[PDB]
Ligand binder design. Structure first.
Ligand code: DCD
Ligand code: DCD
Ligand code: CA
Ligand code: CA
Ligand code: CA
Ligand code: CA
Lengths: 89, 90
């Protein structure tokens, strides 16, 4: 597989791992989203150390009101990050 | 890098690999898009060999109408591909 294909796989893999920890196995609850950001985006985003930060991040990502981040919403988050990086440079 | 950070960097790098080839170096024109797909998505998508298909794929991705695929449009393309992959293993 190409680097682009490996990237696509990485995206579905990391989501599956974190979303599958608790509750709805196809969505990220707050604790799951928090750990994904802290463990997997530590070089891009400041570490989350306040519950009010996780609350605000979920509020931003959650567009259908289940209080969770589904795959579509996670993809929007990834696009936000990749764009912010494409713009940082 | 974490696998996710690697993925983010790869997306940026592959886009610039191809977008820089010709023309504007910040958008994918049809020929740039065609070979990104044929070379870098050869395991996920059928190889493009017609003009009609190059045309239709660009028509689909070109949300702002300028005839090229910019980074935001490319990210939407990637979102399409990844979502299809996710719906599959699920
Ligand atoms: C400067 C950090 N940036 C995100 C704001 C990335 S490393 S792409
Ligand atoms: C072709 C299936 N592939 C699995 C590696 C994805 S769509 S990620
Ligand atoms: Ca979950
Ligand atoms: Ca949601
Ligand atoms: Ca270009
Ligand atoms: Ca366009």
């Amino acid at each position: 597989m190409s680097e682009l294909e490996k990237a696509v796989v990485a995206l579905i893999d990391v989501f599956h791992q974190y979303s599958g920890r608790e509750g709805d196995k196809h969505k990220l609850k707050k604790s799951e989203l928090k750990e994904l950001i802290n463990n997997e985006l530590s070089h891009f985003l400041e570490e989350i150390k306040e519950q009010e930060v996780v609350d605000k991040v979920m509020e931003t990502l959650d567009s259908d009101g289940d209080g969770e981040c589904d795959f579509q919403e996670f993809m929007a988050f990834v696009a936000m990050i990749t764009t912010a990086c494409h713009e940082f440079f």
